[PDB]
Amino acid sequence: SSPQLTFTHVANFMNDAAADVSAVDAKQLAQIRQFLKANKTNLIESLNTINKLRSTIANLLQINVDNDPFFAQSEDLSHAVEFFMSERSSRLHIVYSLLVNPDIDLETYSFIDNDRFNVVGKLISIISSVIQNYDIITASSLAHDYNNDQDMFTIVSLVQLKKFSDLKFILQILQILNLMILNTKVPVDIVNQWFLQYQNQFVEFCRNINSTDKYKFQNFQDLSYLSETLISRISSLFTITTILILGLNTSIAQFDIQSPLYMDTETFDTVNSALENDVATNIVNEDPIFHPMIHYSWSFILYYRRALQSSESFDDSDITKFALFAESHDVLQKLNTLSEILSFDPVYTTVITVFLEFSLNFIPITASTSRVFAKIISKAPEQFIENFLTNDTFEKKLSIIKAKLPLLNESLIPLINLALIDTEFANFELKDICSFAVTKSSLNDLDYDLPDLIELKSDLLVAPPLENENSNCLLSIPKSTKGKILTIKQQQQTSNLIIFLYKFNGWSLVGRILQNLLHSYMEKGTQLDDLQHELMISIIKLVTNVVDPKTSIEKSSEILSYLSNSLDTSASTINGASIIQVIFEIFEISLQRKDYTSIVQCCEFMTMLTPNYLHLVSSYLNKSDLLDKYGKTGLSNMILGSVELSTGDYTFTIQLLKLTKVFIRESLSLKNIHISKRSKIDIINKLILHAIHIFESYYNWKYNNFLQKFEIAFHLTLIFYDVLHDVFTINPHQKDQLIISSSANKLLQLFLTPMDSIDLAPNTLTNILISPLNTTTKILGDKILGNLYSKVMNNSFKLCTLLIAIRGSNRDLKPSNLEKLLFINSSKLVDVYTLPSYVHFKVQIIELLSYLVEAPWNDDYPFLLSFLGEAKSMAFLKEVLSDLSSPVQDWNLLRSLYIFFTTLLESKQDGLSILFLTGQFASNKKINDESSIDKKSSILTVLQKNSLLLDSTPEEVSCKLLETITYVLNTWTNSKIFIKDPKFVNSLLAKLKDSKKLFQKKENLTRDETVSLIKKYKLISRIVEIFALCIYNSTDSNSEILNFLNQEDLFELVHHFFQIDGFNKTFHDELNLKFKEKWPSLELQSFQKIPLSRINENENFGYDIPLLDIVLKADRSWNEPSKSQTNFKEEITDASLNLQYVNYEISTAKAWGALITTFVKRSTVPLNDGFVDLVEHFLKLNIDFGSDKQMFTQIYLERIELSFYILYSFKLSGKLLKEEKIIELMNKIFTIFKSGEIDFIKNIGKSLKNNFYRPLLRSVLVLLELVSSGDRFIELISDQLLEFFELVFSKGVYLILSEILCQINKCSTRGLSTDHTTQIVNLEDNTQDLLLLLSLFKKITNVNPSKNFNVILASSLNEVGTLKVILNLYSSAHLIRINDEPILGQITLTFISELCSIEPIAAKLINSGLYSVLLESPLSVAIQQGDIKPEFSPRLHNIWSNGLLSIVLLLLSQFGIKVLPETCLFVSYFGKQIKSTIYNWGDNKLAVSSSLIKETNQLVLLQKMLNLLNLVIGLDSEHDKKRLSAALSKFLTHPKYLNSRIIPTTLEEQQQLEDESSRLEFVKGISRDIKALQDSLFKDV
């Protein structure tokens, strides 16, 4: 059936597409909109709804069984409950997503806009219904007691989850309702319903749940503190909703009087009566029914409403009672607490800011009010802050403060508090103060002349604000200063003040006041007044805002200069006077006295001071005692152990972690070279030590605020990952250049530990990974409350993946304990994978599993199937199958699943792979047979289904699908279920044919064009690999691939895939050069990426852009290049794509070569002319020096091999081809073999790279086997053939034999190393000298050579020198023993016979006298000694005997009477062996074989031939022939005697005797040959 979409998946998709709607796939977007248009009423209306355990939980859910079929038949009831919660939350997620961004579906959005207030009323009714059944029925259901205890625990846990989910549901509905009713005119019906159900149901519920004074484990503060945390948010949101319904508007920053509430005279009465009833019955309960904000704002609403009308009647009877109530209930601190609780969303900050701006008119600005305003308003958006600061009422109230400014509590403290709103506003109000107000008890001390206009006739000394009494510092007012005297009460609804106009700076005054406060801080001690202490903290915070990096370094420096003008010069610890030193002294004193607020504020100051002033922070951290110094515990640990571990607040720890993050990032920069490396290294090491100390213990602390625990783990996992990533994934050829290398090494040592280790860092990481299975983590970590937990989790997943990758890249590192922990906790990750509420954690889990499986284990291998089990593995398979087959699917999830399948197929996890492929466990291996795959529960079915959607599927997903298919095909299975339906092969062929976008490839490609080319290459490589496998496994079943390969125009399509021309060496070399003059301290290769794994194959080429951004963040040339300057960012981005392009081009060339090779191997029919054209193309490509740049010289080798085998395949078939192409190929192969990248002449290549010229040698040998090419181009043919012949033969033979001389004696002063055993397998003489050279010699001699060719050959041989090296190698054979026998002489005779076969060479060599020279050798004398028999060395002895007889016979036959004396002396010297053989044959007891018959026939042929061409002992006299004939008559009559005398001494003789014996052939050959020769002799005589 159809899987059908669910609300959770649609909500996840809309969350993904909430940023950019156009960025998502258009078809998926259209299908999502089609789903939305069908479900328009089910979003909200379906929420409304007006065997004992299942009935109890069904009553708990307040929904019928048949209403939820998924809940009905779910085996695990917890899964059904989780699914129902997820669907209920996802409906409102969809509604909120539509409200926030209407562009997702404008048709469904309009369904809400036209029915806005009906939806609002429905939301209020739903909130009331949820509150009604929150505890009335759930508590009764929990109170039930049937039997068992595990069921009771499960029911209790489910009830607690349901209650917390109900609270989260209320929070969600409140968020949506506040979004809807904002800046809208609320009808009086909604107002009445809200003001009725708020008093009737909401406040009592909140108070009852807050105080529960009206199963033991997992019910402590881990549970009770949760409800108190949620109820506070719920009450704050009720307060905000009540404020919004009254008519607050953020567009005008004022209450909307024209709302229907105030135009109705009856609904106004109900609200007024409700507030009056709340006021009049307050004292019974100290907490009012309505928040003091509501009464406090109603006071102003009533005042404005009365002022709009004419009559007022009573004034204080009704207007002022609400104000008095609010003031007596401490409205300001309640407002501050309300602002603090609602900090998660920025809208409520705007609401409170506009409320404060509205209330400005009725509030005089004082110390407490200014403090509250600074605390609240400073977090508002910039536009609302500007609106508040530009208000006319605020300006008028600020002018009064600024009038009489230097009065401490009156004006100075409120102005300092107001300065904490905006930095530019503070600068404007503090830079140019132009008023000085002085109060004096006695007027005699002032010499002023005279109604308020006075003048000063002398200089005046006035003590500055908060000046020490003993200090001599005073402020001087010059004479002739106009003054104004004020002695009357302030005119708003004071002492004798005198105000002079005096232009002075306020920053200097504030700095002097701060120094004075420091002096009293270290004099009195810790008993400083709160007013002074808070003034000090406020001044420190103001300077912190001043020194913020958001300010320009110039103006920050100017302000800090202003702040230090009036400081005392008595201090001399550091030259000059600075406010930074004052704040540092305050920090040290506060650290000594354990003052939490002061240290927190100073740590914030020092955290924000780092980016622009690092030479001060580093110096302080060196001098201060906050960090450990040589075995001495620092002040930070003293505070953490005593103060923070008892109070439960860890603001200082989080501030320290933030400082660590900022310090590391600023130290990695390039503008901080003026700071020494050693200080930075020491400080970074100390900070990393502190961070590691914090990491191993924070998880067991007690937290008053739960979010703080998320704020710590977020900062810890963010520091480790950056340090490890910047070091272990960059700079392949170095390991310690970066300043953070030591910290990275120590972190790697701590995280990766051997098996026996028990270190707590891997345990903490693993505990973080499996957190979502906790109840408190499920509740607090939900996305409704916030997204900090999700960031924590993705950081942890990234860190764990990076650690596994780093370990896997080193063979020396043994398997770590973290991987064993992950293997043990592997069934706890499948649980997270299958959780309905966690669908944004699937890709990361799958990637982690793939990385874990890919890791190599040497000693012992852990099996995933053994850890998961039989039940947990099947659930994983079901979830994976459900994910694979969905109507709408995520591309990232599909890609990750394909990568996971590919990785699992390569690994040794055979059980899991078998389960995934076949759907059944590997334990039942007997089931494996034909049709033994469960089609319903196998990945193969889904692979087949998705393989046909190549056009719709994106190219990455399809290419990885093809990788998985190839891995399935090549090794795991032989039955090709894929090719049963030809649709797959047809789709592959269509993609290959229409993939012709590879035409231009050069015409100034853009970035997107290059990316598309890369993807196309990646797809085509996999396609041709699949085709190669399909054609190889089956010869003729895939007739369509054969037809595609047999087409006429294949060559034009495939010829460009074998050429690699997409690399720009000049571009890649000028970029590296130009990077070292702009920034000479850096080299571009330092930022090169390191490939750690194939799972991250896409991001493995080029340079790291984030690291370059970190290093060069402060450089203008990197960030804002000019028009006349190069753009290094874009060039580096381009250079990273070229490497990937070249890599995939080479891969595609390799795959195409493999496919063509495997096609040519099997084909038997004659090939087309397209392959001749392809061979010509390959040879020309090698002509143009395809390896001069050393561009992956295996392309050269594969081209050579392809050309050789295509040429060789023409021998098996006919292939009648013209001689012109033969000549072209022959000339091109000569030009390849001479000079160029090949190293045959230099003799260096032959010893090492013998594969670069041996295919060429066989190609030359077998290409000449075609029709003889010696007629048409006989001139060029002869010239090229002679050149190639001499160049190969003379040089190779001379060099090989010179090397042999080197191993036997001193050839070129290299040294003498004569020995029986040397080098390996005759170097190349075994193959390169006798397999090819003599064969090509014979081919030329069989090619009808001309006399002029022989003459030129002889001339070249004389120029080189011949047969001297032959005698030298014969002496080598004398001095070299192989298998305890001299075997190198078997080829000397062959070479001699080949040389002597032709007349000119033989005639030229005989003049040098080969006979005596070869006879003088000791082996020749040993052979001449006689008594040589085949019993000793049959094969070799017959070989040399036949060789010498053949050469003697041929020379005698060819040459005339000028050689007869030489032959006569040769046979006289060699006659002893012949006589011994004759005597042995006459005496019998000798093994005679076919070789002996051949030797006897050759001797007989030489005899009478040395006679008639006018000696031979044993054959000259006729008596010898008579005796031989008598012996012949004796033995020829007894074949059985000959068979008995025959002894098989040769393998061929043994084989012949085994098969029907050999006596018949032996006797027949002997009889025929001997009778013929005897008849010839008798006729001649």
Numbering used by the authors: 9 to 58, 69 to 232, 242 to 477, 494 to 536, 549 to 1565, 1585 to 1655
Original paper wording:
Nuclear pore complexes (NPCs), embedded in NE, are the massive bidirectional transport channels between the nucleus and the cytoplasm. The NPC is the largest proteinaceous assembly in vivo, which consists of ~550–1000 molecules of ~30 different nucleoporins (Nups) with the molecular mass of 60–120 MDa from yeast to human, and are the sole gatekeepers controlling the nucleocytoplasmic transport of macromolecules. As the core scaffold of the NPC, the inner ring (IR) attaches itself to the cytoplasmic, nucleoplasmic and luminal rings (CR, NR and LR), and is directly involved in the formation of the central transport channel of the NPC. In summary, our cryo-EM structures describe in detail the hierarchical assembly of the scNPC IR, which consists of 192 molecules of 8 Nups with an 8-fold rotational symmetry.
Nup188 and Nup192, two of the largest subunits in the NPC, are evolutionary conserved homologous nucleoporins. Since the density maps of Nup188 and Nup192 are not completely resolved in the IR monomer map, we next performed SPA of the purified Nup188 and Nup192 samples, respectively, and successfully obtained the full-length structure of Nup188 at a resolution of 2.81 Å. Overall Nup188 appears to be a cray shape with a dimension of ∼170 × 90 × 65 Å. The Neck domain is at the corner followed by a crescent C-terminal domain (CTD). The clamp, Neck and CTD domains further form a large right-handed super-helical ring that resembles the letter “S” comprising 52 stacked helices. Surrounding the axis of the “S”, two layers of concentric α-helices spiral up in parallel and are referred to as the outer/inner layer with respect to their distances to the axis, which probably enables Nup188, like a spring, to stretch and shrink to a certain extent. The relatively poor density of the SH3-like domain and the tail of CTD represent intrinsic flexibility of these regions, which is consistent with their roles in mediating interactions with neighboring IR monomers. Moreover, the feature of Nup188 distinguishing it from Nup192 is the existence of the N-terminal SH3-like domain, which is composed of several β-strands and loops. The overall S-shaped conformation shared by Nup188 and Nup192 may play important roles in regulating and maintaining the malleability of IR.
